[PDB]
RNA sequence: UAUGGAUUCUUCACGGUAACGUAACUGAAUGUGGAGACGUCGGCGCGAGCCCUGGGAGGAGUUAUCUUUUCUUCUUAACAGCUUAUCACCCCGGAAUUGGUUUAUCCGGAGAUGGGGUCUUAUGGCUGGAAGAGGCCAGCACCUUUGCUGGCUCCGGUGCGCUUGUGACGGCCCGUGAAAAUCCACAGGAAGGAAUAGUUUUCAUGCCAGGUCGUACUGAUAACCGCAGCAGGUCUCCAAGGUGAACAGCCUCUAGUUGAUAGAAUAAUGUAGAUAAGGGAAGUCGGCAAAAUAGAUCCGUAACUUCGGGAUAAGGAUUGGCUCUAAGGGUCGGGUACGAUCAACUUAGAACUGGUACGGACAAGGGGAAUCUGACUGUCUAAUUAAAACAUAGCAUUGCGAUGGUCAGAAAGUGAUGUUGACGCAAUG
RNA sequence: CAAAUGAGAACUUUGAAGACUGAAGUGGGGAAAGGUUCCACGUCAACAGCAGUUGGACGUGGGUUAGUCGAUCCUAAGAG
RNA sequence: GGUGAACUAUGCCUGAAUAGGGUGAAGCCAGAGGAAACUCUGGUGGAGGCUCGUAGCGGUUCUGACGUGCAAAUCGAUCGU
């Protein structure tokens, strides 16, 4: 009911490469993740926390790794980072952005 | 047919062995007129019809 | 192909004199979502059949593996 | 070269059709040397031979 | 072929009221029973697979803009154990105010309803097989034999869905829809055995062996037959999505092909498709060929008739999109009359809307009034005649009671009808 | 369309396109029949009614593994 | 004096195959009218050498194509079932 699913994304490789802004990516995440069908209605349901190099999305409402990969793909397509970075899950809910 | 009999397979084997051209050396025998195998068979040309 | 339920039937099956191989399989499963327990399957290979004794307790499995005579060829996998 | 055998073998080895088997046009020599199922497996693992993606048949309009 | 288990001072077992249950639990001749062993159609039920579909765990696509989005993996075999069944059967009890009950109307004092049980294991579930496999991912060491290392492989829902299997039924027949090998069982009670031992290899475990022949591939616009790598012919299984009534036509997925001598040009005449102002069969032997009609819903439907039909008669209208409305269901209870969750597609209305268009492609009856003729369905001149010809049911006639009628055979201690018997067989119209 | 192969490419191979069969298929198997056409290597004289470096062609080989699939067993119409 | 039923004709034995619709037979359930006899209505049901129409089987017309053909009988449309 209040089970908190945590999805972590490792942005260390693009951060070190210098072509990624984790803060902007996270901001895009909060302002584009839609709850119940509409964006911004995350009434303290999902949160995004940034440590500078690893962005963690915790959720109590409906949210999925497929959703997160879709959002990340949309952001990298908006920023033209596709064909350069891949979104890959090392472990369950342990995704990362791989460069090489 | 895949489900053959032993007689049919024996005929198969005999025709398979007979279907070969003249050895290169018999053509060089003395007083020899045989130039080529005149009893050659292709599965398309002539049916064994057994 | 035959599943063994009792330890006593397992231990009278061990001493049947037609057993040559005993394979032990270690399994991870789910008792509760937060408590994934370990299961042990002792697969004794007789002539006609393969008997499989199942244990969901690590301690009982340890005691069984100890009480098993070392003469039998045990493949742990 | 003539990689008909290799294409048939790749389809059989990797479980899709010859229409989905993709052979690298720049490794023609390597594929030509590959004349066993084991060598075709080496190639598919090396990425010289790649399973084409399934042609999309979306059900979105139907839904 | 031995060990365990079973069975003995009541020698060849106990239990259950019973249906019957169990790990076993002697059983000869002889006899009997069952399985093998059976058509087709219809609807209904259940299951498998497939289709569809929600969440989640991965990979791929699109991303000017939108889409928690589009596509894809998330599998469980034979076999062993437990369990699970409609139908049947048993026990108690004794029923009209008849009740139970099917989609379909049959069942009950020859014992219904109700309550409690027994059984078949089709079928499903769990466990073993078995995750160690398969699949989906990620990574590592690289003229390296090539492997190894981490994760995941989860949980649901629905249906007049499609196909297959199964079950309980119902319809049909002057048609009632194989045999045998094999296997089991029962009846009977021959033989033999018990107190230091025996009985079974229909209980469990254990040991040995399983010969011979076929097996590749095509199975057809190129592996077969047609003189051929021939537009011909030749038996069968599996069968995704959309539209739609639809294994129609039309477009896609998996899979498979992209093979038919080509290049240039676009004359006449062709072959195959089309369109035509006004007229509308004046053409012609003849409306030949073509056109017109066409799906669904609603309305209306004549003569005649063997009352079943004719009939989709004839003849009219509507049909899109969008936003709504309404009706039609399954799952829980008050101290032993109020509500909540969800699939799902049918039907009927209301606005609004548009170059009045809407079965928008595909698909898809022209109709009527008569005459001749054959009742009909059916059959034939493969390769010029499909008909009014043949057949047919119906009707009628004929022979024959078996040492017989009709018909075979050169004969026969030979045959068909005939595994037959006048409600039959045979011969005719 | 391009590349590779080759003396030579409309026809071979690979990649990219565009298509079609459209699950009572041009797919996956089989029965009869065929008989090695299966597969690899080499090769183009003849054959594939154009071509051919390709092939069901030519040359050389390799390949069909069963107690459980089928025959074998049974009987049917019938044969004898 | 021999050889043919691998085509085809006809029995027999053993197997297999055949969308979706229209009509709506018997049987059964309820209701209405009537003094009665009975008559009528609505459902249900799923019959038929029934019907529209695929696969299949056949071959009407074009007297179409072809007619030194794809073919010593085929091709296309239209048709019968």
Q: A52's torsion region: left (phi>0), alpha (psi -120 to 50) or beta?
A: left
Distance (Å, whole) CA B42 – CA C12: 70
Classified as helix, coil or strand, C43 is strand
* A84, A99 Cβ separation under 8 angstroms: yes
Closest protein CA to C1' of nucleotide E214, residue? B3
Distance (Å, whole) CA A50 – CA D52: 38
Q: What is the resolution of this structure in A?
A: 2.8
Q: What is the dihedral of CA D17, D18, D24, D27, to 10 degrees?
A: 120
Q: A36's torsion region: left (phi>0), alpha (psi -120 to 50) or beta?
A: left
Residues of B (16-35) placing their beta carbon closer than 7 angstroms to any atom of strand F are 16, 19-21
Between CA D20 and C1' G62 the distance (Å) reads 49
Distance (Å, whole) CA D12 – CA D20: 11
Tokens representing B20 are: 């070969």
- Residue whose tokens read 């009278």: C12
Distance (Å, whole) CA A20 – CA A26: 11
Burial A46-55 (b: 16+ CB within 10 A, else e): bebeeeeeeb
* D15, D46 Cβ separation under 8 angstroms: no
Instruction: Let me know the angle formed at the C-alpha of A62 by A57 and A65, rounded to the nearest 5 degrees.
Output: 55
DSSP letters, chain A, are ----EEEEEE-HHHHHHT---HHHHHHHHHHH-EETTEET--SSSEEEEE-SSEEEEEESSS--HHHHHHHHHHHHHHTT-TTT-EEEEEETTEEEEE--
Antiparallel, parallel or unpaired: β A34-35 and A38-39: antiparallel
């Amino acid at each position: 009911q209040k089970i908190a699913k945590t999805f972590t994304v490792d942005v260390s490789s693009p951060t070190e490469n210098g072509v990624f802004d984790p803060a902007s990516y996270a901001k895009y995440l909060i302002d584009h993740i839609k709850v119940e069908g509409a964006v911004g209605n995350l009434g303290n349901a999902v949160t995004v926390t940034e440590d500078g190099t690893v962005v963690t999305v915790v959720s109590t409402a409906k949210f999925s790794g497929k959703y997160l990969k879709y959002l990340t793909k949309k952001y990298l397509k908006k920023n033209q980072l596709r064909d350069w970075i891949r979104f890959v899950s090392t472990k369950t809910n342990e995704y990362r952005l791989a460069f090489y | 047919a895949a489900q053959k009999s032993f007689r049919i397979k024996q005929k198969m084997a005999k025709a398979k062995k007979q279907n070969r051209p003249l050895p290169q050396w018999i053509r060089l025998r003395t007083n020899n007129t045989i130039r080529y195998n005149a009893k050659r068979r292709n599965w398309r040309r002539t049916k064994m019809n057994i | 192909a035959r599943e063994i339920t009792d330890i006593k039937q397992f231990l009278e099956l061990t001493r049947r004199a037609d057993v040559k191989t005993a394979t032990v399989k270690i399994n991870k499963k789910l008792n509760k979502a937060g408590k994934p327990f370990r299961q042990t399957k002792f697969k004794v290979r007789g002539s006609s059949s393969l008997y499989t004794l199942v244990i969901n307790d690590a301690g009982k499995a340890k005691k069984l593996i100890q009480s098993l005579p070392p003469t039998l060829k045990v493949n742990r996998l | 070269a003539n990689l008909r055998t290799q294409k048939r073998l790749a389809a059989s080895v990797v479980g899709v059709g010859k229409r989905k088997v993709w052979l690298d046009p720049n490794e023609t020599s390597e594929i030509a040397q590959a004349n066993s199922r084991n060598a075709i497996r080496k190639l598919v693992k090396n990425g010289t031979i790649v399973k084409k993606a399934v042609t999309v048949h979306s059900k979105s309009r139907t839904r």
